[PDB]
Write a protein that binds this ligand. Structure first.
Ligand SMILES: CCCCCCCCCCCCCC(=O)O[C@H](CCCCCCCCCCC)CC(=O)O[C@@H]1[C@@H](NC(=O)C[C@@H](CCCCCCCCCCC)OC(=O)CCCCCCCCCCC)[C@H](OC[C@H]2O[C@H](OP(=O)(O)O)[C@H](NC(=O)C[C@H](O)CCCCCCCCCCC)[C@@H](OC(=O)C[C@H](O)CCCCCCCCCCC)[C@@H]2O)O[C@H](CO[C@]2(C(=O)O)C[C@@H](O[C@]3(C(=O)O)C[C@@H](O)[C@@H](O)[C@@H]([C@H](O)CO)O3)[C@@H](O[C@H]3O[C@H]([C@@H](O)CO)[C@@H](OP(=O)(O)O)[C@H](O[C@H]4O[C@H]([C@@H](O)CO[C@H]5O[C@H]([C@@H](O)CO)[C@@H](O)[C@H](O)[C@@H]5O)[C@@H](OP(=O)(O)O)[C@H](O)[C@@H]4O)[C@@H]3O)[C@@H]([C@H](O)CO)O2)[C@H]1OP(=O)(O)O
Ligand SMILES: *[C@@H](O)[C@@H](COC(=O)CCCCCCCCCCCCCCCCC)OC(=O)CCCCCCCCCCCCCCCCC
Ligand SMILES: *C(=O)CCCCCCCCCCCCCCC
Ligand SMILES: OC[C@H]1O[C@H](O)[C@@H](O)[C@@H](O)[C@@H]1O
Lengths: 150, 390, 517
């Protein structure tokens, strides 16, 4: 029957909460663009080559060091440093849990009751985006989000 | 994103990556003592000795310098080593996690440019076999534990060879992909006694059964410019993972010092696939000899914190089991480490440095000198505590 | 940071299952002279005499139809012609910006010695030209060939218009100049207007002729284009060798040529009603060679002994081939290339599942014979059977690295000259990978005949018909030739595919295969 076309996983970028009702999940992997690590159609001559079909498997590992600069009720500000690695796969036969896209960087997060959660992060991608001819690092990236985008 | 850079990963199922957690990897794999805060993934009986829930994660940064009779090259690799969870359930112990069985990786370039009509090859390899495990341990006695586990092996090994002549601009790129899947079972036991005053005798025995690996191969040849690839008929080959018997014994005082030795032997296996079949390469039985231990100056010390850090060290001699050019490939190395306990909790941060030499430059082979730096996180917390005073 | 490669341990990895090797195949190539070709829609035409040491001397003439910018004009009352000047811009580039405004130009596309002079004669054509003509129920196109110089030369009326004997640089001693023709007009109420014009062909035509031909002509003759073209059929440009001076040839774009008639009329008056006069001007533009079929390039060539002998039907071997290939532009010659050897083994190539990495044809220039003559900058290979570009031409979308060099595009396809350190041509390489791939991939495909001919621009891929089709073989014909070949007046000598030619210089097809094992 095949895997359903809905309820798929999209990895890469700033990430977004599960606001959609179709089950689509956006995972955050700093240092790379949005949905840049999702598997793409590789049939080339399928008239839809390069389109992101969605992933059925995903695993992300992250480590962070946070230091609080202010933790008052009016405003809570803390700095963080991260070391992430994650990847998405199209099927179980292609699942390689230890073949991940690594990234590193730092960010700042500010939380105000009226303005909500504000976050700015700078990540560096140590791997190339899927479908890239040259095996070169993705490079620096900037991510900005408002609210709990998990 | 590869895990290894050794050309020897081409043969067999790749280079053996997992060799224990940083706490045990820093002791050359000697896990005789029945720890209460660390996970001994290689022995299922250790799951029963856990006293608090344990969550472990590890990573390493490897640096190697490949040397041959022609020249030398430097390579570095960074990878995620493991993820395991331990849960104490009464007299039982349950553990589940994900570990890398083997890894395939090499990036060799034969530059024959500057001369018209010369073929240039760009050999590359990636992938490996991963393992998922679920083990249960039981305390037959307060100091005697037995356990069993089930492990499912899965992974994909892809080998690519691209050749391009100096003159023409359209080259060819042959790629071989193999998907492996299988399951195996492990059995173990750990017994601890008290020979002398405050001195204990630790013993551990583990056995891994032989498993059958199913490999689905797909070989396709592509040429630049041509939109139609030449694909070979699909094939299915069967591999046999050899059985392993690990015997360990040591003497020492708990929380003070420990000295032990471990002997690991492997049976007969069939790791030769369709793409790695060669005539100059053979296989033999794997055998590892290691000696290691730890030393804690004063665990219950309030003056100096350096006395509470667990200092580990170990020596290891391994016979990989492959004979290339009639020369047995052996790996010799030394490991050092330290376990820093986070104040106020049983959780700790492990740091280790391993250096050694694999292979030899004789008989036109390749020798690899590596210096690996690893970091591990062991988190412990007590769960399932009932709250009275209804 | 683990994306670097190394050269350690390559001997331990197993060998692949494909064999990258190249094969050599013989080619059948012979010479085929190009008789009178169609010169009706050539974007660029040649005007002058070019002397080639190896090929010979070629004389190029030109005939065109004239047109009026605005028909049914109001010339005025009592018109008196002041001057009749014909201006045709030359292909030139600014080479050195000078002070006091002005510029310094260098003529481009000039073939022959820089000091050459020719006797230019501009006559009024008396041969009506048409773009199409009705036939037995069909509207056939009108074609003018390169060998029709006699027809246009015999039907010429009067004497040459450029009869101003006071200026010998416009007649009897004409030479393509590079002046800037500085003009100053104090008409800005007193201020001057220093206006400069790029180099162009300026000729003073007979004022008396244009007085009665246009200024004093019946209104029924200039009412429309059909009547005007019947009245003023066109202009004929004849070139001859000047007295005691060499000759040169130039490629011009006559679409921008025009003859402006400046005269004085009696003005609309009615206010002052005096004998006053006003300045008026009428422009007689030359028809566009692309939008009209009333332009022909009369090319006459005096083939040399060696060139004529090689292209002669008595010295051409269609079975084995020719040792030397003489390909010249214009009404010159081409080369028929057949890949018979590859076709014979085509059955076994497709049975072994071999794949083609690249296919190429390397043409070696005969430096010893091609000495002292200008060499063509590029060659073109097409399909002689279907008279269409090869599949490789369309599949190559590469553009020239140099900015603004549209002539060097499609470098992957090939054809560009490969000059050595001596600044002389050495060889031409053309890649036909796609053509060979289709032959092995598709079983119903047939090996067509290939034609090699000099080309001026790779963009122009149209074809011009021959007055009389040539029968190459029982059911094989040579009816058309690439349009870019007629425009190029140069030619080159290449080594043929005969078995007698040395293997290092012989023409042969080289195919690189990926033999799967
Ligand atoms: C416990 C926790 C919960 C988990 C539960 C799961 C456990 C339960 C068990 C599940 C297994 C069930 C499988 C099943 O069955 O259901 C499947 C459905 C299962 C539903 C499960 C639901 C789960 C619910 C969960 C709920 C949760 C709440 C579907 C299926 O079935 O798919 C099957 C697929 N498997 C999967 O997809 C699973 C997937 C996995 C999916 C599930 C993943 C779940 C994970 C999620 C959990 C995560 C939680 C956190 O894997 C993968 O994704 C990769 C691995 C995954 C990685 C996981 C990572 C985890 C990470 C975790 C990290 C934390 C399978 O692969 C093999 C493996 O399967 C599993 O593993 P793998 O896949 O390898 O991984 C096994 N077992 C497993 O347990 C693996 C599990 O993953 C393990 C689970 C792991 C869990 C981990 C838990 C983690 C959490 C725990 C934490 C602690 C493995 O065992 C093993 O070794 C392994 C082991 O030992 C087993 C035991 C292991 C147990 C583990 C213990 C637990 C331990 C845990 C802790 C350690 C085993 O090796 O291939 C089969 C194809 O076979 C057929 C077919 O389809 O019919 C027939 C074939 O014939 C056979 C035969 O007959 O015998 C087969 C062989 O025997 C062999 O001998 C072969 C010869 O070689 C032939 O030469 O012949 C052949 O056809 C031929 O057969 C005929 C016959 O006569 C032969 O002659 C011929 O007829 P004729 O000629 O007339 O005679 C035919 O020709 C005719 O027809 C042709 C055409 O005309 C017809 O046209 C078309 O139609 C055909 C029709 O057939 C199509 O219908 C097509 O096929 C044709 O191609 C064609 O296109 C022409 O052909 P041509 O000539 O032109 O070519 C020809 O001319 C002629 O006409 C033709 O030739 C073939 C064709 O070649 C393909 O093209 O097709 C598929 O069908 P199947 O046959 O039914 O099996
Ligand atoms: C080579 O070009 C160079 C890359 O060059 C760059 O462009 C620089 C990359 C950007 C540098 C980082 C920028 C941000 C600063 C903060 C860094 C993050 C620190 C986090 C520490 C606390 C954790 C949150 O290549 C390199 O620079 C090579 C990098 C090699 C790094 C090797 C060491 C990594 C650690 C090894 C263990 C794996 C980590 C997981 C540990 C827990 C186990 C689960
Ligand atoms: C070139 O490859 C440079 C090294 C690549 C970056 C190294 C950092 C990798 C991060 C891994 C994080 C693993 C998970 C941490 C906690 C679960
Ligand atoms: O560049 C203008 C001129 O260039 C040369 C040829 O390509 C002509 O067809 C074209 O008219």
């Amino acid at each position: 029957r095949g895997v359903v076309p809905f309820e798929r996983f999209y990895l890469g970028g700033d990430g977004m909460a599960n606001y959609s009702m179709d089950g689509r999940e956006t995972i955050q992997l700093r240092g790379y663009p949005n949905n840049s690590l999702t598997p793409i159609i590789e049939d080339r001559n399928s008239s839809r080559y390069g389109q992101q079909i969605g992933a059925t498997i995903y695993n992300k590992f992250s480590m962070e060091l946070r230091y609080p600069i202010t933790l008052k009720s009016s405003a809570s500000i803390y700095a963080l440093t991260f070391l992430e690695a994650g990847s998405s796969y199209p099927t179980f036969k292609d699942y390689n849990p230890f073949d991940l896209n690594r990234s590193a960087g730092a960010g700042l997060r500010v939380f105000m009751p009226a303005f909500g959660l504000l976050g700015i992060d700078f990540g560096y991608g140590f791997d190339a985006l899927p479908g890239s001819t040259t095996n070169k690092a993705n490079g620096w990236e900037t991510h900005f989000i408002i609210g709990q985008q998990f | 994103q590869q895990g290894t850079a050794s050309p020897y990963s081409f043969y067999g199922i790749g280079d053996i990556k997992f060799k224990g957690t940083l706490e045990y990897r820093s002791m050359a794999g000697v896990a005789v003592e029945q720890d209460s805060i660390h996970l001994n993934i290689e022995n299922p009986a250790s799951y029963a000795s856990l006293m608090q829930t344990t969550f472990t994660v590890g990573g390493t940064f490897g640096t190697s310098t490949l040397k041959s009779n022609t020249g030398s090259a430097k390579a570095q690799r960074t990878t995620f080593d493991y993820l395991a969870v331990g849960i104490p359930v009464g007299k039982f112990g349950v553990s589940f996690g994900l570990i890398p069985l083997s890894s395939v990786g090499y990036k060799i370039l034969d530059d024959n440019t500057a001369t018209e009509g010369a073929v240039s090859s760009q050999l590359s390899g990636k992938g490996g076999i991963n393992k998922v495990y679920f083990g249960v341990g039981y305390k037959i006695k307060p100091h005697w534990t037995i356990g069993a586990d089930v492990q499912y092996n899965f992974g994909k090994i892809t080998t690519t060879s691209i050749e391009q002549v100096t003159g023409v601009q359209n080259g060819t790129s042959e790629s071989n992909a193999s998907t492996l899947s299988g399951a195996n079972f492990d059995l173990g036991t750990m017994y601890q006694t008290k020979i002398y005053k405050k001195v204990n005798l630790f013993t551990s025995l583990s056995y891994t059964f032989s498993s059958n690996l199913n490999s689905e191969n797909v070989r396709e040849i592509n040429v630049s410019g041509d939109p139609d690839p030449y694909a070979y008929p699909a094939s299915t080959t069967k591999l046999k993972l050899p059985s392993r018997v690990i015997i360990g014994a040591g003497i020492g005082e708990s929380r003070k010092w420990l000295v032990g030795t471990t002997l690991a032997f492997q049976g007969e296996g069939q790791l030769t696939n369709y793409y790695n079949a060669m005539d100059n390469v053979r296989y033999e039985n794997y055998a590892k000899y290691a000696i290691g231990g730890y030393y804690i100056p004063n665990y219950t010390s309030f003056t100096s914190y350096l006395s509470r850090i667990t200092y580990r060290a170990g020596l290891k001699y391994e016979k990989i089991g492959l004979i290339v050019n009639n020369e047995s490939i052996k790996d010799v190395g030394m490991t050092l480490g330290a376990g820093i306990p986070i104040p106020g909790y049983f959780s700790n941060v492990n740091i280790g440095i391993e250096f050694g030499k694999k292979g030899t430059v004789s008989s036109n082979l390749v020798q690899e000198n590596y210096v690996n730096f690893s970091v591990g996180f062991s988190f412990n917390d007590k769960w399932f505590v009932k709250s009275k005073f209804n | 940071c683990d994306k670097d490669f190394n050269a350690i341990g390559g001997d331990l990895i197993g060998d692949d299952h494909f064999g990258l090797e190249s094969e050599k195949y013989d080619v059948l190539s012979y010479n085929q002279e190009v008789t009178s070709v169609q010169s009706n829609v050539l974007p660029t035409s040649a005007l002058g005499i070019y002397s080639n040491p190896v090929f010979g001397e070629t004389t190029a003439n030109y005939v065109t139809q004239v047109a009026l910018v605005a028909y049914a004009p109001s010339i005025g009352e009592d018109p008196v012609i002041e001057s009749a000047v014909l201006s045709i811009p030359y292909f030139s580039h600014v080479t050195a910006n000078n002070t006091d405004g002005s510029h310094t130009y260098e003529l481009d596309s000039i073939y022959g010695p820089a000091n050459g002079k020719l006797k230019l004669s501009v006559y009024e054509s008396g041969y009506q030209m048409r773009s199409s003509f009705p036939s037995n129920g069909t509207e056939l196109p009108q074609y003018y060939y390169t060998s029709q110089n006699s027809t246009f030369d015999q039907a010429k009326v009067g004497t040459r218009l450029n009869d101003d004997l006071t200026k010998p640089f416009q007649n009897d001693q004409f030479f393509f100049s590079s002046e800037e023709y500085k003009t100053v007009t104090k008409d800005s109420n007193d201020k001057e207007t220093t206006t400069y014009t790029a180099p162009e062909m300026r000729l003073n035509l007979n004022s008396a002729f244009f007085q009665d031909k246009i200024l004093k002509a019946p209104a029924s003759k200039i009412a429309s284009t059909d009547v005007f073209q019947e009245y003023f059929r066109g202009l004929y440009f004849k070139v001859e060798k000047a007295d005691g001076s060499p000759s040169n040839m130039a490629l011009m774009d006559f679409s921008k040529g025009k003859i402006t008639i400046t005269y004085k009329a009696k003005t609309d008056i009615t206010t002052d009603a005096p004998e006053t006069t006003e300045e008026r001007t009428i422009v007689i533009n030359l028809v566009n060679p692309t939008s009209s079929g009333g332009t022909a390039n009369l090319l006459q060539d005096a083939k040399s002994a060696g060139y004529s002998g090689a292209i002669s039907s008595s010295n051409v071997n269609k079975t084995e081939g020719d040792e030397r290939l003489y390909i010249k532009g214009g009404q010159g010659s081409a080369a028929v290339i057949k890949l018979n050897d590859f076709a014979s083994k085509l059955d076994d190539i497709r049975a072994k599942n071999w794949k083609v990495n690249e296919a190429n044809l390397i043409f070696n220039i005969d430096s010893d014979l091609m000495t002292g003559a200008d060499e063509p900058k590029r060659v073109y290979l097409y399909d002689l059977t279907n008279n269409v570009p090869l599949a490789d031409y369309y599949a190559d979308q590469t553009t020239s690295l140099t900015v603004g060099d549209t002539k060097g595009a499609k470098y992957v396809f090939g054809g560009l000259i490969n000059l050595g350190d001596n600044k002389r041509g050495k060889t031409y390489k053309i890649r036909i990978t796609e053509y060979i791939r289709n032959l092995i991939k598709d079983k119903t495909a047939k090996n067509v005949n290939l034609g090699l001919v000099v080309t001026e621009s790779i963009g122009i891929t149209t074809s011009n018909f021959l007055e009389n089709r040539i029968v190459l073989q029982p059911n094989e014909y040579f009816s058309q030739v690439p349009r870019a070949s007629i425009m190029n007046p140069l030619g080159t000598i290449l080594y043929g595919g005969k078995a007698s030619v040395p293997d290092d210089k012989r023409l042969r097809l080289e195919v690189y295969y990926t033999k799967p094992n």
